[PDB]
Structure 1
């Protein structure tokens, strides 16, 4: 199905954010595992899988709209150096990514690509779940203190 060319540019920009998240979150997962924080590591692993599934859906939509998925260009990864930096780096990636999802949805609606909009709203639903998780961990660290927070995420 010939799809709108700016829609496809948008889809490819969102795809570009997923591929950053995939790699960013996977490395965070394995850093946590390596430091003995296996509960943070497991959860972060599943975040990474969600982003992999976002990427898949975008790639499949782009191809169906007869565009060319771009897996070549990869933005800056925000790799933190400690647990609090790492959650904040994820948050900042998410908030940026939702900005771009909103503008892409706006464009889909102008052009009447309601299916692409439905796809992008479903991803948006999921990134707002991620943001809620990230904000809440940053909040808990304040409430229970960093030492207690890490202790509670040592063991699954």
Structure 2
């Protein structure tokens, strides 16, 4: 039998809650950024949302294989920025929360002997550190050239 560990399912569900939160956060940021004129940042944000959708699908699939029930009924609390730098910082804070949850989860899976699930958390963890490297670089850039120049760089002219 393939019935998984209850503590393992719990961690996948906890990870799923964060991923659904991040999907919604990134998508709302995409629409707000677009409304503010920052069409190029907006596009990156849409892609980040779609990437997290793919993660959530992977977690769902692993939960059902372990004969657990995935919880899509509730969403982890959203951080909504009100200008460009706040959007980047709200996202980064979310990715650190995610990193820390995935770090704890791979250790729990490891101790309980569920090594395929550990491997899933390890892949999520390397992902989030990817997103974290990206966001921290953008924020350094914003700080070195200033918000208004970072805004201009990430906006399109009116004929696009």
2:52 aligned with 1:48: no
TM-score using structure 2 length: 0.95
Corresponding residue for residue 67 of structure 1:
68
**Could you give the per-residue CA deviations for residues 92-126 of structure 1, whole angstroms, max 9, x where no partner exists?**
11101111101100011001111111111111111
- Segment drifting more, 6-15 vs 121-130: 121-130
Corresponding residue for residue 40 of structure 2:
39
Q: Secondary structure at the match of 1:8?
A: helix
- The root-mean-square deviation of aligned C-alpha atoms, in Å, is 1.0
- Segment drifting more, 90-99 vs 61-70: 90-99
- Segment drifting more, 31-40 vs 13-22: 31-40
| Count of matched residue pairs | 156
Taking the TM superposition and a 5 Å limit, the aligned residue runs for 1:4-153 are: 4-153=5-154
CA distance in 2, matches of 1:10, 1:60: 14
CA distance in 2, matches of 1:81, 1:111: 43
Q: How many Å apart are 1:76 and its aligned residue?
A: 1.2
CA distance in 1, matches of 2:21, 2:75: 6
Q: Secondary structure at the match of 2:154?
A: coil
Q: How many Å apart are 1:60 and its aligned residue?
A: 0.2
CA distance in 2, matches of 1:97, 1:3: 23
Unaligned runs of 5+ in 1: none
- Which stretches of structure 1, 4 residues or longer, exceed 3 Å deviation after superposition? none
Unaligned runs of 5+ in 2: none
CA distance in 2, matches of 1:139, 1:151: 16
Q: How many Å apart are 1:137 and its aligned residue?
A: 1.1
TM-score using structure 1 length: 0.97
